[PDB]
Each structure stands twice: as structure tokens, then as C-alpha cells.
Design a protein around this nucleic acid. Structure first.
Ligand code: MG
Ligand code: MG
Ligand code: MG
Ligand code: MG
Ligand code: MG
Ligand code: MG
Ligand code: MG
Ligand code: MG
Ligand code: MG
Ligand code: MG
Ligand code: MG
Ligand code: MG
Ligand code: MG
Ligand code: MG
Ligand code: MG
Ligand code: MG
Ligand code: MG
Ligand code: MG
Ligand code: MG
Lengths: 54, 67, 143, 206, 56, 63, 145, 56, 141, 55, 70
RNA sequence: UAAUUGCGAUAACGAACGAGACCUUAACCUACUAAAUAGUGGUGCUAGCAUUUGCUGGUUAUCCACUUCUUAGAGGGACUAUCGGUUUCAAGCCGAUGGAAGUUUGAGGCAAUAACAGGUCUGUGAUGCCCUUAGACGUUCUGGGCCGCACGCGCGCUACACUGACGGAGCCAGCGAGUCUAACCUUGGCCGAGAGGUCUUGGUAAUCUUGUGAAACUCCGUCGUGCUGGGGAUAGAGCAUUGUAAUUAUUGCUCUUCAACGAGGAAUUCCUAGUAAGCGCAAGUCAUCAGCUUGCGUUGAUUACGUCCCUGCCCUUUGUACACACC
């Protein structure tokens, strides 16, 4: 507690003087999309394998 | 949207074909008539059927109607 | 012509009973009156200051008279109302219980109400007397 | 006037007009006939009613709206802007209050003066949004007699409601001022102003 | 004892479900088709309907 | 200001791309037997009275 | 009710408790302008001073006004409940005070400065211009200082 | 899979049903899962009659 | 025994029960007369069954009405309906048809549902909005 | 209860219910019939509670 | 500014002098002639009804209405 | 037509799922079967006022009698009926009349095949594989944190007041829920300004809490248009309440503090009748905590009865080198 009050670089008028980063308003990033149907698992079960099961 | 479905007009169809005698134009007679002749599992359906086969009659007397 | 308090309009009534309850002068105002708010949900203390205890007594009475029995609890639930939680939405509150009990406690002493069976406060037989009385006079003011 | 009495009494002035002429809380439904052509059947005036509160059916079918009592449509369009949604009592009393006021100034019938401000304020022709072959133009079109009373009711209420906003005056006064200024349109009223300019915009693009 | 009628009958069907699921599993190899609970004075009757009773 | 009182004798259709306007052939009451087609704003049925602020002119197609 | 007159002896804009107070308004609401004086405290006191609440702060014989003064710094002597007051039980002398006018700003300081000199989480919270009552600061408090 | 469901239905049909529907979702022997609809006869899929006449 | 009918008015969730018997001409509601009713703006609407038919009709009969259910305005349109139906229930059972149908003829000429209950009912709320039809506001993205 | 198991989708509620009907009959009987009427006329899923005292 | 919170006797002289010719007088029309703030506007309409002058055809809180006496 | 709902046209005819039917709930039963856990009438018992009988109440059942209110068994009612318009005089559509009800009678419930790498291994003792498995990612104990605040975005709550705030006063609901291995719904009475405490009371509940005397609202006044007595942020001091525990203040009260906001830019959502909007309640969650939800009633409009212009989606026609199907 002793350090907390006296320490400058701390407060509200402190932070309110600095500039808000651009990543604040970065919107979405979309992640992975429109790649959804293309299988990263990269297997493709086989004609004989899918007829033996079903 | 008041329109009779096929299960209503098919009933009304096959009713008047064999039952045209009896089956006076008046609803309430025909409605009650239906219980003793045709078997229908719903209160409403019977009334819906009746009211339509009623309509078939009321026009039929002005000349034939298709089907 | 014969009279009951149900023959007299609500507000014209309770004023007159409060008019005479003043000239009576025998009430027992608890002494914290004029400093008190009547509710936990109210903004200001009553605008009448001296008085309004004559009005709440004349309120409480005519209510107790019109029905079977009414407890201080019910009286809390009645007069109370929507309170302003301000920024928050308005919820019902009961009025100040003591204010409603010390009308009953001091309407008992004045013989216009009585501790009932079944709990509560039932209108007094002499209450029926004293109420219907000023009822008739109120229509007989308008002659 | 034949004052019959019975056990629980009905007051004299009460008793009087009731069995007698059918008038408002008290005001004359006779006289007060539509002061313009058209507007008939779109200005009700019958059957008479004591007060402007009614159960009402006027929704479920189209022109049942125009059959409602015109003063009832006055209070109906009156209760609004948020907090006043519902709460017809405030409006019905403000109208009796207003009728009290219009009658007090230059006499006659406030109920007729109401109709006098309605028959005045209907725009005769107005404009529509037309896409075109370019920048949208204005097509002057005549406007329905029903709508003519429609946009007249809100016209007066808006002006009486908008002017009563944040000024010491009371709604009934701003209601009467509006109705009176429009009874014979003085162009000083919010309603008569808007009427002319939307009829001006029609003669404008023509 | 001392149950509300409301709270009891809820705790009844719950007693149905619980007992129904204990039989769904243990008796699965008998083809257990579901139970019924007939209650009377004295006992509580519990009726298995399986397709193999002999193993039950 | 000449007052043109035109009774709606028939409802035609709804012009405009948003379809608020109602097409109507009317009849002016002074000196009947002649007729014009005008365009209205709000709700309209037959035998409504309408006030034209000019007599002879006609609209047809709105879009 | 009844029209009154008096004379020019009605005076607007009277100064008391080192604050200027508007006349020509109901005296109950002229006393709330003074700091530490709210609508309840102006009500109870104006009552307890036996002053007409129908009357405006304008006339108010200076004997009346000096009565109104006296009770505001003497609450327990004129029997105002002691729950009716803002500073109760204090932090030091243990007594109950109604702090008023320029003295509420004055005593307000000490409360914070105590908490500040104590190195209290709420004084920390105060030094930083933040929300001391524990509410979420994320969304609210934007246009700020 | 195909023999189990087709045999089951024939039994439920031979047992005098008015129809039956065997669904199997999931993955069997091949990593990507699929479904299957095995069905026969007649069913109603909607309304109250489902509660009475179809057992699921 | 006295000749006694009973009727009811219904407006919204209100039920206004009527006892119309033969008597000295009292009309009182719950425990209180019809000169109160206390909207006091709309009390003219419970006067309405009387002033349509004329005031004399109510002498040889007695009227009491007791309402429970609904709100303030809800009960009035019930009790004015509870009256007009008793006054045609009395003229139904005791005095002849032709006057009952003279009242029914001038009751429903001006109407406002003195005889007929108002079938309009509160609709249920559906999830997704505070009201029945009203839906919660959507922001897209 | 929310239809969906987890979080997502438009928020679909669902209202289940269970209907309880309660009847009671009054009789005056001797000892043999109360015991005879109660011991039989059992039935599954129905809850039969009987006793006299005026209280 | 406009004040109108006090008698200022020549204002009271206005009252008896300036309220004929009024087809409408109320709380608003009192403040509408350059005088009489509302808290005394009712006071003035009560005292104006001490005798004659205003004739009370209206009723209550909010709307007040009067005319001259004849 | 709301509908592959039909009419009709017709190499098709006649059927199936889905739609509809069905189901639930809401509207109507001076008719049927009944009810001290629902009431109405009469009769006693009784209080006040008028005293002409009367008006208005109290009344452990004191008995008589009843079912209109109410409650839930059993049924009946609507079929867009009657009629007049219109149209391939076809399905239908349209107005009046009748009617509890004529927008599929209003509202839901249920819901065909097919598509998604939509969401959910954080609901599961549903589960495959991989990870970890004793210095544990298992489980627990201690404490903090999910609330952290230069800011960006979304659902909302409260406000800018005079159709209003405030003080009295009149005082009106429905859907609800509630205590046994207890500590719940709680009347009533007492002490307290308030919050609340305490002594009793009924209720496993159509029986007691409850008539949940809800709130908008009506009514008589206090203010008087002035960031005002509109607004209640922020904050200080004091009292209580939940709980082992409240500081970063669970919640409530009392007083003091009195910010922004003077109708809100581009945009943009919901909604057609007892609806919208205003108002509160009950339930979910809960030891304490609703600015949230799921229902409910209370007050109750303005405006459509149309359209394809924006937007979205369905259908045919068309084209194709796609068919893992424009990711
Ligand atoms: Mg209340
Ligand atoms: Mg109140
Ligand atoms: Mg101050
Ligand atoms: Mg599948
Ligand atoms: Mg599939
Ligand atoms: Mg279906
Ligand atoms: Mg089918
Ligand atoms: Mg439906
Ligand atoms: Mg821990
Ligand atoms: Mg979170
Ligand atoms: Mg209830
Ligand atoms: Mg209850
Ligand atoms: Mg304030
Ligand atoms: Mg949109
Ligand atoms: Mg709780
Ligand atoms: Mg609870
Ligand atoms: Mg919390
Ligand atoms: Mg290919
Ligand atoms: Mg590409």
C-alpha cells in the first residue's frame, strides 16, 4: 500500500494523457473461415473402407 | 384463408354421390345426418365437411357442377 | 333519511372526520410527528406537518369500518407504493409501520376501534356511532 | 321536467338532460353540422356520446375507424409520446377541459369548433416519392377524405402537444389555442401552416 | 412423511425415472421393455416387462 | 378559388413502386356526365368525395 | 388564499452562514442552496424554528432567520433526532455533527485525507480518481475528468 | 449395418406395424461419420397422433 | 320470497355480478351507491343504461352490483353491462316480452356492449421479446 | 427451460408441464364398507387418501 | 427576471383594474400578463373568488377557468 | 389460398408423408352432474343510522334452500351460416345481417425429406483417439481473480419534466409459490423514523399467507418553468440485514453531496388490435444479490388492409468445363 499511492505512472489523469492503441478498434480477425469445408485432417476415407462399414 | 382441404372436399364429394336424397340444403340437418352415415373422428371436421357438402347441394340445384 | 359512510364520497368524507378529529383535540400525536416521512419509499415528509395524523386516522378509520378487520401489516401494504430507486426501476414498498400502528394504538384509546378476535383491529361499536354521525352531517352540510 | 326520485337519489341537474336531449357531459350534439363538403361519413357526430371513453371495435376492419366519434378520435390521438401511451382518462378529461375553454372564448360550440378546425386543416393534394429516370421528383396527388381527417387530427394534436412542451401553459389551453386558431384558419396555428405548405408542394410540382 | 401433494408427485415420476434407468441398464441383456409401478396399501408393486423373464 | 368536388365512381388500382397511391376514375358533381382519372394518397373506397385543386389534368403511370 | 402586502421590507438576496441565499422563493428551498442543507434538513428545521413555510425567504424578520441559523449548528439541543444528521459519532471526539456551508467541503477533505494518510485501499482508490464504491469501471466513466 | 436394420424392420413389419423408421448416425469403420435412413410402410410425422401411434 | 333475477357484466378479466329484485328504487354498487363509482369521469357510463331507457323504469325494482377482478376501468364497463342485462332479465321473466324487446331495441341501438360481453382478451407473451408481438432489439454486428 | 443444451443459437425456450387433478368425496359409512371400498378399487398412478375427522 | 412572486401593490391595483375584458382567466393567463407567478396565481384566483369577478365553471388542479361577473 | 390450399387446364388417373386434420390454452352455456377447501339467496344471532317497513356491516355451520357468479367432469356451439355483391359466376374474395366467437375464431404445441465440417467432449458414470496420471492437468485446503480500466462495440435501466415531480387521498388484478427430519409461505400483536428486530398464528394449502388493498392510474392540494422542488450519477458519515467470511464497499435505510442530460449526428431495431407502447407482479436463479429472463394481468392508442423500391428468400426459365458441387 505504501508504494501504491506515491508511485507516479499510476492514476487516471496519468493514463488519460496517453494514446489509445490501434488494436483497441481492431474488429474481428474472422479466424479460419471459407476454409471450413476443405479438410485440414487430410484423410479421405477410402472407397473400399466406406463400403465395408456402411 | 378459408379454403377446404382435399379430405373435406373428397368426403363432400363421395357423400353427395350416394346420399343426394336425404341431404337437404339446410346445414344442421346434413351435419346431424353425417354422424349416422359417415364416421369422422373430429367435431370440427364433421362440421367442415357438412358445411361444404352443403355448398355442393345449394349450387347443384342451379345445374350440375364438375366432378 | 338514514346514513352510512358508504353514502358519502371518499375524499369529502375523510376530510370532515379529520376536520372534527382536529376540533376534538384528543388524539395523541406521538410527538415524532412533523419530523417523519411515513414511508421508506417516499421523498419528503407530509406537506401538512401538523395534521395528516388527523387525516391518516380519518383514513385508517373509514377503511377499518368498511370491512371485517385490518391489521397494521395490511396498512403498511396499502398506503405504500412505488419507491424511486432512481437509476433503478420502481418497486413497491410498504409505508412506515409505526405511523400506521400508532394510529391504531391511539384510535383504540379514542374508542373508534378495538382489538378484535381473529387478530387485527375491528371497527368499534362506538366507532360505527361516531362515523355514521359525521357522515350524515356531511350531506347535511350541503343542504 | 318530470323529477322522479327513488331510494338512492339521482341529482336534479344530473336527472335533467339525461332522459332529455342526449348531449355531452353537457354540450349540444344538434346543430354542429359538417362545415365543409366531403368529410361526410368521415366526420362522425353520431351517435352522440356523453364522454369520449368507449370499449371500441374500430381495429379489425378497415373503415370502421372513420365511424368512431370524432371527439373520441381527438382524445385517442391525444394520449401519446411515450409516458402518455394508454392513460385515456388524462386525455378524456383534458378534452372536456378543452371544450370548456373553447366554449368560454367566442361562445358557440367547442364540439363544432373542433370540426371547424378539422374541416379547415385537411390537405387537398400532396406529393409522393417517385423514383423516376434520375433524381427523384414530386408527383402531386389528391389525398383521401379519410386521410384528410387523419392527418388533420394529428396535425392539431402535434402542434398543441409540441407547443405545450416546456411552457407554463396547460394542454387544454394549447389544445384550444390550436383549435381556435384553426377554426377559421389564422395560419398562426401549427396545423393550418402545415396544411397550406403541403398543398403548396402539390401546386409546386404539377 | 409429511409431503405436499405437489412436491410428492414430482418426486414420484423422479422415482419412476430413476428406477426406470436402473432397469434399462442391468436388464439390458434380457431385452427389458420398461416397467410399471402399481402402488396399494401395504406394498409397492414393481412390474418388469422384459422379453426374457426366465433370466430375470 | 373554384371548388372542384369529384366523387370517386370506381377504384382502379394501386400505382407507385411502393403502392401507397390508389388509382381512381372520378366524377365531378357540378355538371356530371364527364369523368377524369386522378391519384389519391390514403385509404380510398368508392363514392368518396375528393377535392381537386385543378380541374382538367390526368395522371396515369407512377414509378 | 389571502393576499398579503407588507412593504419594501421584503428583501431579496439575503446572506447567511457565509453564503448568499435567494429571496422571493419558498424559504424552505432557499436554505437548501447552502451546502450541507438538503430538502429534509431544510424542512425539519424550518418547522422546528416555528417559521411559516407558506412564507417566502424574502421578508423573514432577522430574528426569525437567526433562529433558523441557531438550530442548524445545534441539532441535539433543539431535539432533531440524531439520525437526521450527516456526521454521526465522528472518528475522534465521538460526537454527532451536522456540518454545513463551507465546512462540509472542509470536513470532506479530512475524511479523504485520513483515508489517504492511512494508506487505505479506498484512499488509494481516491488518489487515482477512480470509483471507490467497487463498481465495474470497464464500460462506464469515459468522458471523465 | 445394412443387414441388421433391414432385418429389424422386416420383423417390426412382420409384427404387424403400420411402418417403422431406423436411423443410425455416427461413424462405422471409416473416419468420416455419416447417417442412414432405414424405413418401411407408413408413418405420420407430426401432430398429436404421434404421441398415440408412434413409439420412439 | 320477492321476484329476483341475477345477471353479470364481464369486461376483460372483470366480473360484475348483479342482483335485480323488486324494491323501493335503490341502485348501489358493492356497498356504495351509483352516485359514486369513482372514476367520476366515466361514472356517466354506468349512468348510461338508465338514461337510455329513462329513469322511471328503476323504481319498482332494486339493484345491487358487486365487482371483483380486473382494474379500475375494467370493472366499469362490466357493471354498466351487469345493470342493462338485469333490466332485460327482469323484463324477461316477470313483465312481458314486448317491453323487454323495447329495451333491447333501444339498448343496442346506441349500444356500447351493455348486453354483449367484450370478447377481446389479453394475448400470451412469446419468448424473444418483452411483449406478445414485440421482439427484442437485434444489432446484427 | 432453454431448448439448447449449451449456449448458442436464437434463444428458444420451452415450457414443460405436469397436470395434477384433485377430487374428494364425502361419505358416511360403517366400519366394513370403508375397509371394503378402500382395500379394492386400487389403480396405478392414482393417489387415494381417505380419513374422517371433522377438524 | 420576470419575477412575479410578490404583490407589489400596483400589481394588485392591476388586478381589480385589469380583469374585466378577459374572456379567459386561469393560472396560465395570470402568468401570461407579465405578473403573478403560479404559486400566487392560485392565491389570486382564490382571493378573486372571495367576491364576484371570476365565475368558476371549471374544476381542478391543472385546469382552472373563469370569466367576468354579470 | 397461409400452404403442392384448391379450382381449373390437362396423358394422365387415382393415393401417400409434410399442410390441414390433430393437440393445448383462451372466448360462449340462467341447460346436465355437483361442491364448509367455491360461493349466491332466505332464515335465525347482532351493531350503527333512520326510526314506518328501511340502508350498511359483523355472524365457529345456527339451520332452510340453491348453482347465476366459481370450480372441473360430461356435452353442445362455427360451418366463414344467412343474404347481397364479384370472379373463368369455378376455388374463392367482398360487405351488411345474425352471432360468445367469422384475421387458419385469437395464441401456441406438434412438424416431411434435405443441407451446415453451424454450436455443444465446460450437462452427463454418452464416447474414439492424443495428452496427463503421483513434483497430478486427478481431488482437496488457504487466498486472489474472473468486477481488473487511456478506450472501441452490443442488450438494457434511469432521465431531460407542467399529459410533470412531490404530499396527502381514493384504491383495481392475473399467471404464481410455499414448512418434516423441517426452519419455508407467513397473518396478527408488540419495539423501531427507516431498514428491521421480537412474541405469537394458520397453512403440505381452492382450507393459512391472499382479496397477494401491485404499479402506472383517478382526486385535492404544495411548486411554476427557472439545468427548477426535472434528473439522481458521484461521494461522505451513521444504522441494520444475508453469511465462516462483505475491504475491491452483496443488499437496505437516514442525512448530506446535486454531475451529465435543454429531445440526441450518420445510421438502426420491434411492431397491425386488447396489439403497440406505458405499468407493476409472480415465478426461474437464490444463503445474500434483477438494471436479466420465463409467464401474467392492469392502462390502452396513432396508422396499414397496401406494395416489390431498398433488403432478404422461394419458384420456374436459362447457362455451365462445377458434382468434394463457387469455400
Ligand atoms: Mg396502492
Ligand atoms: Mg397512495
Ligand atoms: Mg444543498
Ligand atoms: Mg444425421
Ligand atoms: Mg440428415
Ligand atoms: Mg400440424
Ligand atoms: Mg397428412
Ligand atoms: Mg392455428
Ligand atoms: Mg479456492
Ligand atoms: Mg463474464
Ligand atoms: Mg388472484
Ligand atoms: Mg387468495
Ligand atoms: Mg429529487
Ligand atoms: Mg431491418
Ligand atoms: Mg427467497
Ligand atoms: Mg424462495
Ligand atoms: Mg454478486
Ligand atoms: Mg467433374
Ligand atoms: Mg474462387
Amino acid at each position: 500500500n505504501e508504494g501504491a499511492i506515491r508511485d507516479k505512472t499510476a492514476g487516471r489523469r496519468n493514463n488519460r494523457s496517453k494514446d489509445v492503441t490501434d488494436s483497441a478498434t481492431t474488429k474481428k480477425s474472422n479466424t479460419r473461415r471459407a476454409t471450413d469445408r476443405h479438410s485440414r485432417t487430410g484423410k479421405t476415407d477410402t472407397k473400399k473402407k466406406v463400403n465395408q462399414g456402411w | 384463408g378459408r379454403v377446404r382441404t382435399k379430405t373435406v372436399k373428397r368426403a363432400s364429394k363421395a357423400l353427395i354421390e350416394r346420399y343426394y336424397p336425404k341431404l337437404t340444403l339446410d346445414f344442421q340437418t346434413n351435419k346431424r345426418l353425417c354422424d349416422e352415415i359417415a364416421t369422422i373422428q373430429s367435431k370440427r371436421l364433421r362440421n367442415k365437411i357438412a358445411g361444404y357438402t352443403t355448398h355442393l347441394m345449394k349450387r347443384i340445384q342451379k345445374g350440375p357442377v364438375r366432378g | 333519511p338514514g346514513v352510512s359512510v358508504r353514502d358519502v364520497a371518499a375524499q369529502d368524507f375523510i376530510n370532515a372526520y379529520a376536520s372534527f378529529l382536529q376540533r376534538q383535540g384528543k388524539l395523541e400525536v406521538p410527538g415524532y410527528v412533523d419530523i417523519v416521512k411515513t414511508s421508506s419509499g417516499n421523498e419528503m415528509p407530509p406537506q401538512d406537518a401538523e395534521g395528516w395524523f388527523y387525516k391518516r386516522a380519518a383514513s385508517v378509520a373509514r377503511h377499518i369500518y368498511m370491512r371485517k378487520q385490518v391489521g397494521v401489516g395490511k396498512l403498511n401494504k396499502l398506503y405504500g407504493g412505488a419507491k424511486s430507486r432512481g437509476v433503478r426501476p420502481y418497486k413497491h414498498i410498504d409505508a412506515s409501520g409505526s405511523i400506521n400502528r400508532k394510529v391504531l394504538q391511539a384510535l383504540e384509546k379514542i374508542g373508534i376501534v378495538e382489538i378484535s378476535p381473529k387478530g387485527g383491529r375491528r371497527i368499534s361499536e362506538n366507532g360505527q356511532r361516531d362515523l355514521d354521525r359525521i357522515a350524515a352531517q356531511t350531506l347535511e352540510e350541503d343542504e | 321536467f318530470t323529477p322522479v326520485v327513488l331510494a338512492t337519489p339521482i341529482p336534479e341537474e344530473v336527472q335533467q338532460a339525461q332522459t332529455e336531449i342526449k348531449l355531452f357531459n353537457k354540450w349540444s350534439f344538434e346543430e354542429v353540422e359538417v362545415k365543409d363538403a366531403s368529410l361526410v361519413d368521415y366526420v362522425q357526430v353520431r351517435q352522440p356520446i356523453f364522454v369520449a371513453h368507449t370499449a371500441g371495435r374500430y381495429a379489425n376492419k378497415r373503415f370502421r375507424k372513420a365511424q368512431c366519434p370524432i371527439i373520441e378520435r381527438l382524445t385517442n390521438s391525444l394520449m401519446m409520446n411515450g409516458r402518455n401511451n394508454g392513460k385515456k382518462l388524462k386525455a378524456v378529461r383534458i378534452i372536456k377541459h378543452t371544450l370548456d375553454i373553447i366554449n368560454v372564448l367566442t361562445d358557440q360550440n367547442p364540439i363544432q369548433v373542433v370540426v371547424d378546425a378539422i374541416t379547415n386543416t385537411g390537405p387537398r393534394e400532396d406529393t409522393t416519392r417517385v423514383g423516376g429516370g434520375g433524381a427523384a421528383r414530386r408527383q402531386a396527388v389528391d389525398v383521401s377524405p379519410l386521410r384528410r381527417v387523419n392527418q388533420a387530427i394529428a396535425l392539431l394534436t402535434i402542434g398543441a402537444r409540441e407547443a405545450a412542451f416546456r411552457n407554463i401553459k396547460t394542454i387544454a389551453e394549447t389544445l384550444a389555442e390550436e383549435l381556435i386558431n384553426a377554426a377559421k384558419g389564422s395560419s398562426t396555428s401549427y396545423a393550418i401552416k402545415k396544411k397550406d405548405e403541403l398543398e403548396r408542394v402539390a401546386k409546386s410540382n404539377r | 412423511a409429511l409431503i405436499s401433494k405437489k412436491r410428492k408427485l414430482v418426486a414420484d415420476g423422479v422415482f419412476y425415472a430413476e428406477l426406470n434407468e436402473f432397469f434399462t441398464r442391468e436388464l439390458a441383456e434380457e431385452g427389458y421393455s420398461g416397467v410399471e409401478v402399481r402402488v396399494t396399501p401395504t406394498k409397492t408393486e414393481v412390474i418388469i416387462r422384459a422379453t426374457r423373464t426366465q433370466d430375470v | 378559388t373554384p371548388v372542384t368536388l369529384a366523387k370517386v365512381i370506381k377504384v382502379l388500382g394501386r400505382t407507385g413502386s411502393r403502392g401507397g397511391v390508389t388509382q381512381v376514375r372520378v366524377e365531378f358533381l357540378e355538371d356530371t356526365s364527364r369523368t377524369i382519372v386522378r391519384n389519391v394518397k390514403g385509404p380510398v373506397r368508392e363514392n368518396d368525395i375528393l377535392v381537386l385543386m385543378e380541374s382538367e389534368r390526368e395522371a396515369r403511370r407512377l414509378r | 388564499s389571502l393576499v398579503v402586502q407588507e412593504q419594501g421590507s421584503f428583501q431579496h438576496i439575503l446572506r447567511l452562514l457565509n453564503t448568499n441565499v435567494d429571496g422571493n422563493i419558498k424559504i424552505v428551498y432557499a436554505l437548501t442552496t447552502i451546502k450541507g442543507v438538503g430538502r429534509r434538513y431544510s424542512n425539519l428545521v424550518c418547522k422546528k424554528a416555528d417559521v411559516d413555510l407558506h412564507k417566502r425567504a424574502g421578508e423573514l424578520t432577522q430574528e426569525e432567520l437567526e433562529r433558523i441559523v441557531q438550530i442548524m449548528q445545534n441539532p441535539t439541543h433543539y431535539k432533531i433526532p440524531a439520525w437526521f444528521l450527516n456526521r454521526q459519532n465522528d472518528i475522534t471526539d465521538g460526537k454527532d455533527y451536522h456540518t454545513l456551508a463551507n465546512n462540509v467541503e472542509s470536513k470532506l477533505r479530512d475524511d479523504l485525507e485520513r483515508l489517504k494518510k492511512i494508506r487505505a485501499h479506498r484512499g488509494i482508490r481516491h488518489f487515482w480518481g477512480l470509483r471507490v464504491r467497487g463498481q465495474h469501471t470497464k464500460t462506464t466513466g469515459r468522458r471523465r475528468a | 449395418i445394412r443387414r441388421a436394420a433391414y432385418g429389424v424392420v422386416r420383423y417390426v413389419m412382420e409384427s404387424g406395424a403400420k411402418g417403422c423408421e431406423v436411423v443410425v448416425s455416427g461413424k462405422l469403420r471409416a473416419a468420416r461419420a455419416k447417417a442412414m435412413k432405414f424405413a418401411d410402410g407408413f408413418l405420420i410425422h407430426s401432430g398429436q397422433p404421434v404421441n398415440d401411434f408412434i413409439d420412439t | 320470497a320477492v321476484p329476483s333475477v341475477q345477471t353479470f357484466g364481464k369486461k376483460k378479466s372483470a366480473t360484475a355480478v348483479a342482483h335485480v329484485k323488486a324494491g323501493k328504487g335503490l341502485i348501489k354498487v358493492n356497498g356504495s351507491p351509483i352516485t359514486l363509482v369513482e372514476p367520476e369521469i366515466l361514472r356517466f357510463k354506468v349512468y348510461e343504461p338508465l338514461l337510455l331507457v329513462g329513469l322511471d323504469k328503476f323504481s319498482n325494482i332494486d339493484i345491487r352490483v358487486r365487482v371483483t377482478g380486473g382494474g379500475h376501468v375494467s370493472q366499469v364497463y362490466a357493471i354498466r353491462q351487469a345493470i342493462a342485462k338485469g333490466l332485460v332479465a327482469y323484463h324477461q321473466k316477470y313483465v312481458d316480452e314486448q317491453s323487454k324487446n323495447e329495451l333491447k331495441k333501444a339498448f343496442t341501438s346506441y349500444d356500447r356492449t351493455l348486453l354483449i360481453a367484450d370478447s377481446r382478451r389479453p394475448e400470451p407473451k412469446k419468448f424473444g421479446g418483452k411483449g406478445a408481438r414485440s421482439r427484442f432489439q437485434k444489432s446484427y454486428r | 427451460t432453454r431448448k439448447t443444451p449449451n449456449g448458442e443459437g436464437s434463444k428458444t425456450w420451452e415450457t414443460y408441464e405436469m397436470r395434477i387433478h384433485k377430487r374428494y368425496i364425502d361419505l358416511e359409512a360403517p366400519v366394513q364398507i370403508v375397509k371394503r371400498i378402500t382395500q379394492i378399487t386400487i389403480e396405478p398412478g392414482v393417489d387415494v387418501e381417505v380419513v374422517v375427522a371433522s377438524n | 427576471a420576470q419575477h412575479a412572486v410578490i404583490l407589489d401593490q400596483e400589481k394588485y391595483d392591476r388586478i381589480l383594474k385589469e380583469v374585466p375584458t378577459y374572456r379567459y382567466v386561469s393560472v396560465s393567463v395570470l402568468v401570461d400578463r407579465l405578473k403573478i407567478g403560479g404559486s400566487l396565481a392560485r392565491i389570486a384566483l382564490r382571493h378573486l373568488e372571495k367576491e364576484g369577478i371570476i365565475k368558476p365553471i371549471s374544476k381542478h388542479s391543472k385546469q382552472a377557468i373563469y370569466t367576468r361577473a354579470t
